[PDB]
Write an enzyme that holds these catalytic residues in place. Structure first.
Site, PDB file in Angstrom:
ATOM      1  N   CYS A   2       0.883  -1.097   0.000  1.00 48.43           N
ATOM      2  CA  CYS A   2       0.000   0.000   0.000  1.00 48.43           C
ATOM      3  C   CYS A   2       0.935   1.162   0.000  1.00 48.43           C
ATOM      4  CB  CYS A   2      -0.880  -0.098   1.245  1.00 48.43           C
ATOM      5  SG  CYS A   2      -2.113   1.235   1.360  1.00 48.43           S
ATOM      6  N   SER A  32       0.437   3.728   1.535  1.00 50.66           N
ATOM      7  CA  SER A  32       0.395   4.448   2.827  1.00 50.66           C
ATOM      8  C   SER A  32       1.674   4.390   3.624  1.00 50.66           C
ATOM      9  CB  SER A  32      -0.786   4.106   3.700  1.00 50.66           C
ATOM     10  OG  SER A  32      -0.616   5.110   4.752  1.00 50.66           O
ATOM     11  N   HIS A  64       4.844   6.383   2.306  1.00 51.94           N
ATOM     12  CA  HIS A  64       4.788   7.618   3.063  1.00 51.94           C
ATOM     13  C   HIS A  64       5.616   7.502   4.352  1.00 51.94           C
ATOM     14  CE1 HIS A  64       1.016   9.282   1.022  1.00 51.94           C
ATOM     15  NE2 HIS A  64       1.728   8.459   0.263  1.00 51.94           N
ATOM     16  N   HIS A  80       0.685  -2.651   6.656  1.00 56.56           N
ATOM     17  CA  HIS A  80      -0.600  -2.670   7.424  1.00 56.56           C
ATOM     18  C   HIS A  80      -1.664  -3.437   6.642  1.00 56.56           C
ATOM     19  CE1 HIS A  80      -0.798   0.418   4.524  1.00 56.56           C
ATOM     20  NE2 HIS A  80      -1.908   0.994   4.913  1.00 56.56           N
ATOM     21  N   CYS A  85      -6.912  -2.610   2.964  1.00 61.05           N
ATOM     22  CA  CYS A  85      -6.755  -1.181   2.654  1.00 61.05           C
ATOM     23  C   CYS A  85      -7.253  -0.944   1.256  1.00 61.05           C
ATOM     24  CB  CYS A  85      -5.280  -0.765   2.738  1.00 61.05           C
ATOM     25  SG  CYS A  85      -5.018   0.756   3.704  1.00 61.05           S
TER      26      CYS A  85
HETATM   27 ZN   LIG Z   1      -3.040   1.467   3.195  1.00 66.79          ZN
END
Ligand SMILES: [Zn+2]
Ligand SMILES: [Zn+2]
Length: 374
Positions: free
Chosen positions: A46, A48, A51, A67, A174
């Site tokens: 992902c 995310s 980041h 995650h 996600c």
């Molecule tokens: Zn994510």
């Protein structure tokens, strides 16, 4: 080895800021009180995640990233009513403490108990179950899905479907119940409508993917990417626009098509432009637009009060607006049940260890979603 006594394992350390992945060796304790060690099987990259590899998402370092994964339990503290070994699981990046104003409220899934608000790197006791053979590595959200073994509390863990292809069911974490769920528990999409989709990757097809769920009819999907359309129309897309085609604001070539605009729209791009750009191409009387994704690394966005006043709704949601312990599972089933399939998201399946040629295809475009197999 297996246990009730620390473990073998090679989690991957993210030794600090956009330095690739250290595919180290670590020492995970056995599951403290009320916790649950899980032996992963699969995880996704992902963004995310990216980041943190980047400054963009502040969260304490060193930390185990990931995650988005599907595990198989392997140990369980005393106190755990909810799961038992050999059991399949989806670690939950969003808690489910079954009670705090948001948990007991009818639209509240951001459990007052997460790390997103202020990353602390710990575990719910303010302590971390991971040593770098010598140094305490911190946690991520409460999953740290990037290791071959992890320790997640119980509020942060959901029991999926005993013959759930652990491979596929990772996504329901996600990528896919964020996209798909916007379309379904947030923008309460209606049978009939005209729905616009801004972003045609991993999360948007999952989003285009829940409209059709929601009810129906017209799902335009804009992507200035001549390629993302097959897949696009492939999963429920009724049609495909590319803002590059036309010499006029797309915000306009849309208002046309709907005859005053698509009913519902969604930015699954995370661009500070495309975000103002779709509050816009929705009906000003009653139209509704939800912000899906949002770079942690950002300036506000420039915007006209006037788009809200005609009477229009701007929403937003974390984890498809879904309350998670109670949902990942309904959601598998539906996969199990047949309802929606997961492959067109799955563009890449890899031996976990090339976490970095992994995080590559992520950065230099090329792939929708990819499963880092354990
Ligand atoms: Zn994510
Ligand atoms: Zn809660």
């Amino acid at each position: 080895s297996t246990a009730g006594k620390v473990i073998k394992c090679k989690a991957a350390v993210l030794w600090e800021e956009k330095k690739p992945f250290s595919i180290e060796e670590v020492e995970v304790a056995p599951p403290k009180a009320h916790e649950v060690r899980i032996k992963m099987v699969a995880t996704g990259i992902c963004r995310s995640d990216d980041h943190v590899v980047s400054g963009t998402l502040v969260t304490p370092l060193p930390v185990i990233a990931g995650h988005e994964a599907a595990g198989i339990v392997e140990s369980i503290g005393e106190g755990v009513t909810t799961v038992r070994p050999g059991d399949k699981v989806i670690p939950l990046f969003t808690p489910q403490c079954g009670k705090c104003r948001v948990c007991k409220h009818p639209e509240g899934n951001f459990c007052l108990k997460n790390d997103l608000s202020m990353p602390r790197g710990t575990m719910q006791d303010g302590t971390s179950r991971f040593t770098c053979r010598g140094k305490p590595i911190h946690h991520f959200l409460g999953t740290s899905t990037f290791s071959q073994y992890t320790v997640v509390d119980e509020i942060s863990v959901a029991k999926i479907d005993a013959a759930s292809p652990l491979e596929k069911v990772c996504l329901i974490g996600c990528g896919f119940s964020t996209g798909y769920g916007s379309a379904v528990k947030v923008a309460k999409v209606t049978q009939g409508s005209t729905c616009a989709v801004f972003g045609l990757g991993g999360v948007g097809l999952s989003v285009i993917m829940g409209c059709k769920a929601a009810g129906a009819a017209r799902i335009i999907g804009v992507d200035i990417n001549k390629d993302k359309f097959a897949k696009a129309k492939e999963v429920g897309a009724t049609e495909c626009v590319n803002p590059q085609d036309y010499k006029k604001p797309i915000q306009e070539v849309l208002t046309e098509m709907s005859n005053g605009g698509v009913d519902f729209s969604f930015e699954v791009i995370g661009r500070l432009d495309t975000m103002v750009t779709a509050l816009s191409c929705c009906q000003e009387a009653y139209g509704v637009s939800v912000i899906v994704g949002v770079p942690p690394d950002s300036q506000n966005l420039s915007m006209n009060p006037m788009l809200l006043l005609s009477g229009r709704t701007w929403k937003g949601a974390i984890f498809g607006g879904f309350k998670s312990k109670d949902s990942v599972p309904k959601l598998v089933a539906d996969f199990m049940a047949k309802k929606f399939a997961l492959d067109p998201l799955i563009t890449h399946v890899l031996p976990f260890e090339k976490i970095n040629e992994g995080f590559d295809l992520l950065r230099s475009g090329e792939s929708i979603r990819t499963i880092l197999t354990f």
